[model samples]
Target: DLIPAPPLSKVPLQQNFQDNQFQGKWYVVGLAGNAILREDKDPQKMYATIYELKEDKSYNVTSVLFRKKKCDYWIRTFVPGCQPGEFTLGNIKSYPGLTSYLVRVVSTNYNQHAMVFFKKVSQNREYFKITLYGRTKELTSELKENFIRFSKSLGLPENHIVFPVPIDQCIDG
Candidate 1:
């Protein structure tokens, strides 16, 4: 699911996926909305997690933030020949319009990092941001700056975004 938009954009992660598609387990290290921070400010100290490339062409997703400690699951199938800049979410048999949540990989080093993006389809949608993925939370200050830079390039208001609080620095971690 690491395809890029046509006419080529500077989505670095999706650009990397042009050569290497992600296929494995990815623990949610951090997410950027207004700024980077723990996803949802989850009280359970859970992180978003996805198990990708299952036999059914669907990915398995779960969240540690759920109180029951059980994953609220879904099967995410991909649209064929779809590039990072263009992909659809949910299987035809399941969610329909929510496909805007479909993510296209922007960049990665296979095992180190990945950048992903999706549009919000919620009724009162405002804007969107690129999800900066990393293998670990201990990113160099320089990389953090780059992540913020990329987010800003997407037109996201950086100051409004809560800065990414490293997952490792979390109290419950």
Candidate 2:
């Protein structure tokens, strides 16, 4: 294993989650760790995410990236877990290495900001990702440091963190 898997309880879950307000576009404000994506030397090629809540309480997720001056996108779904804030990955078709993953809404207010915890398995390797999400592209240093502290608490080296600026070249109309 590249990274040790921590008990999911270590990552706190949001109470009274309102998936209705959470259903919409979200900025991938910051990403810590290389579980799903590798550490990049250049600023990251950000992929914006949009969520549409399904009638069955699952989510249809779409992530868009701009590469080669055009839009590149992928799809995934989030199936609600037994608990309120916990979620399980339903289907993802574009990733290269990962076979299974879990999603947890660590903290979120829907309108302002959120932090998502990803305990991912890529083939035989296991790792963690603490993703900071925001409604806006820019985030405060306080928020960034808060995210960093959370990452540090998870035993991630400081080098694994990156705040990829948002890209709008591929925004949906």
Candidate 3:
């Protein structure tokens, strides 16, 4: 048998979150419990950036910059009333028709690591992201390992996790 992913923690969002998570930057530590792979063997492809929060309640995001290349950006807002351990992402107003991603806060440490659980809102779609924020690269060994362990606990297969393929040869800092 293959090395299995970690078992699902089943930790409730109330135990893994903080209120008004804005201002400081966040970084993507891990996603779907799969070790992200670089598009060109570079780690930079495996990350995203979360900019400061805005009054509009939307946070800016950038994706895939392995070689200092231009990354795609978007403004995402969290679902209001996302407290006591549950919330959603995306422009709620724009996607008013789209259902919220059932997010449960897994942790609220000063380190900014949190476990997010997206319930099966749509059987045909996947809704988890390797998303986070920080001024610079913030891939701590402990944080990364925890993400893997968390996913395994949730019954997600190790190989099914999506690794953002980098476009350049930038090493993850």
Candidate 4:
């Protein structure tokens, strides 16, 4: 509990976030974080995610990232959280200090876009990260405004919020 974090009041779970409905392909358009994920921290590009929900409520996730003109695949499983639409990193047995990472659906329409809230601990200090995802490569301008405002409310500066190019070819292969 030594890790520091932002006020949870500003970040709450989306009401009626149905996991089954939320499952599918989602494209990453933007990201925000307290100290990480700055544009300069750029070992990344736009990545897409696929969520396959199981009967036990765990999801088999696959990440598709295009780098060096090739598609890179990373696979991980996510265990559902205590409440609906909340999830914690799965297979986390030997995590130092037993610390955990939490990912929750802060906002979504089960269609257009979903704003995700994440808790990551760094060297014992915890921070929240926000991600912008949508069914397609582009989201409505109106929705982007909400993301900017939401991240700002959490104290993330404008530059800290970043958008990377979406290369559709990365996942279709």
Best by lDDT: 4
Candidate 2 local lDDT, 36-122, one digit each (tens): 444464568666789899999999989877777888887888999878777888854557777778888888989878999988787
Best by TM-score: 4
Higher-ranked by lDDT: 1 or 2: 2
> Which ten residues in a row are the worst by lDDT in model 2?
34-43
Error of 2 at 171 (Å): 3.8
lDDT of 3 by residue, 1-173 (tens): 22232322565455534455533544444556333333344333445544344575544433434444644454555553446555566655465445545555566464555445544233334344323233345546676666766665655565544334332233232
Q: Each candidate: what lDDT?
A: 0.48, 0.79, 0.47, 0.81
Ranking by TM-score: 4, 2, 1, 3
**C-alpha lDDT (0 to 100) for residue 121 of candidate 2:** 80
Q: Residues 1-173, candidate 1, lDDT per residue (tens digit)?
A: 11222212645434434332565544444355432334454422324445455565544443333335443443455553365434555554455334245455665666766666644443334335565556654445665577777666665554433444434322122
Error of 1 at 166 (Å): 5.1
Clash count for each candidate, listed in order shown: 18, 0, 16, 0
> Candidates' TM-scores?
0.62, 0.87, 0.58, 0.87
In candidate 2, list every pair of residues with a backbone clash.
Answer: none
